[PDB]
Amino acid sequence: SLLERGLSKLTLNAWKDREGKIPAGSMSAMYNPETIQLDYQTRFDTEDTINTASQSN
C-alpha cells in the first residue's frame, strides 16, 4: 500500500549462466498463485557409536 492500489504480478526472469551476465527471456504471469510454499529439509544421520556414552546425530 502507502501510495496506490495497483497489483504487482510475479515475474519469471531467465538467464543462461549461473550469474546474471547472459539474459534469456523473461515473462510476467497474470493471475497470481493464491499460495506459495517453500519447503526446507536437512538430513541427519544417527551416530551408532559402540561406546554408548552419548546419543547424537
Place this chain on the structure above:
Amino acid sequence: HITLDIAGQRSTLGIRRLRVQQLINEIPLAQLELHIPTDNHGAADNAVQHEVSRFTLGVRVGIAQDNKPLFDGYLVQKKMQLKGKEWSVRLEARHALQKLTFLPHSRVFRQQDDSTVMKGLLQSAGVKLTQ
C-alpha cells in the same frame, strides 16, 4: 540338534551360521559365527563373557549334527567384529591335517614303498591312513 563342543564342554551359545567344508585333497574346515548378546544385562551379561574367553587359539572343537559327529577339529582364526551394538565373533576350525601345512621339514626316504613313505608322514599328527 546341533551342539558345539569346545574343549570338552558343550558351550551353550547361539550359532547364527555354521558351514562345514570338505574337499577331495584339502584340509576340511568349518566356519562358525556367533552373537555375543549385549542388550540383556545382569547375571547373564558377564556369564556370556566367560564362555567366549574359553575360545583360545588351538582347542578341541567338536560339531555334532543329529547325534552324529559332524566336524571334530582344532581351532584357528577367531575374528570378532563389534559394529555398533552388534558384537559377533567368527570361528574357524581345521582338521588334524592342519599340523602338517606350515613347517618346512626335510627327510630322505631311501628303500621305501609309496605307502610307507606316506603313512609314516601322516602319522606325525595322529592321522590314521586307511589303504
